[PDB]
Structure formats: C-alpha cells, structure tokens
Amino acid sequence: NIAVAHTDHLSVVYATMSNFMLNFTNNFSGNHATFKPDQYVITSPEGSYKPIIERQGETVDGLTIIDTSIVWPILCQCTYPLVRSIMEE
Amino acid sequence: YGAAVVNIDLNRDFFDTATGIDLTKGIPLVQDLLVPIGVTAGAEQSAEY
Amino acid sequence: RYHESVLEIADIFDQADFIQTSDAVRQLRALMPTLSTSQIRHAIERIAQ
C-alpha cells in the first residue's frame, strides 16, 4: 500500500537532495560487502592530526545514535501525497 | 427534412446518470474511478474517459 | 547493446479464464494512467458506490 509513495515520490526527493551543495561526501556505493568511506585528515609536520570522521560516542547534537524503530511509524503510521478524495498536489 | 447530421451515440436513456456516465460530450465520462495520482488538478480528466 | 522494457503478463500468458487477454481490454489498459493498489482500490470503491 505504501510503496508507490516511496519509489515514485520519495526517491525523487533523494535524487535532488543528493545534488545539494553541502552533501559533499560519498555516503555509500550500494555494496555492503566492500564499501568503506574515504578517510581524510587535516595534518601537519608540526604534528597536528584532525580526522574528519572520528568515533566519539553519543554527542550533544543527538544525530549519532540511531533508533531503527523509526521504520515502524513509516510503514504503519504515516500518510503520503501519493498513497492518500485521493487527489493531492 | 433539414436534418444536418445524424450520429450514432451511446444511448443516454440506458447509460443513465445513475450509472455515473455523462454522455453529453460524445464520450462516456465517470468522475472518480481511475484517477491518476501525482499530477496537477486539471489533469485527471482524460481518465474520466 | 540491449533494450530494457516492461513485458505485461498478458503478453506472455494467454488463458481464457485466468487472464483477460482480449485486444479490447488491452486497449483499455493502454488508456489507463499508471496505477497502484491504492488507486485500484479507489476504483473498486467507486464502482461499489
């Protein structure tokens, strides 16, 4: 019931967001078996070493931990313009 | 005498408004059956055919 | 060197009571907007209405 709203609408939103100016990283290549993110550092002979990607545990921003249960409201507690009288701009 | 055009149309008295059909424009047209989704407000109309 | 395309079940199967395959219903499908289970259900709710 919900799939057309994903594939035929939300996917377009991903395709555009992917070209946004600030989405500068390559997040994934679609191959779980081999994909590994590119890893850069600011670094100097004076000995500074700043990784761009660090493992720092939960942060104040709250973006770090992932509740996968978010999957549930989506499948069974959300309307969409394509899925749901049924015309909607 | 004086008839200008004689057409063979679907019969309004049988395909009545009770069946949803609207024969006035020379084709059957039912309102909210197979509406397209994801399109602008005037774009449903051809599906009415 | 290849060409991707859809292939309708009616374009491979043909069985009189299984899968309608008459050219008329083929043309009817040709005139249909792209659909979804939601749209189909809406159509059925309308014919019931």
From Swiss-Prot, chain A:
Annotated compartments: Virion
UniProt superkingdom: Viruses
Task performed by this protein: Inner capsid protein that self-assembles to form an icosahedral capsid with a T=2 symmetry, which consists of 120 copies of VP2, with channels at each of its five-fold vertices. This capsid constitutes the innermost concentric layer of the viral mature particle.
Quaternary structure (record): Homodecamer; each decamer is made up of two conformers of VP2, called VP2A and VP2B. 12 homodecamers assemble to form an icosahedral capsid.
Family named by the database record: Belongs to the turreted BTV-fold inner capsid family.
Protein name from the UniProt record: Inner capsid protein VP1
UniProt source species: Bombyx mori cytoplasmic polyhedrosis virus (BmCPV)
Parent-protein residues present: 693 to 790 of 1333
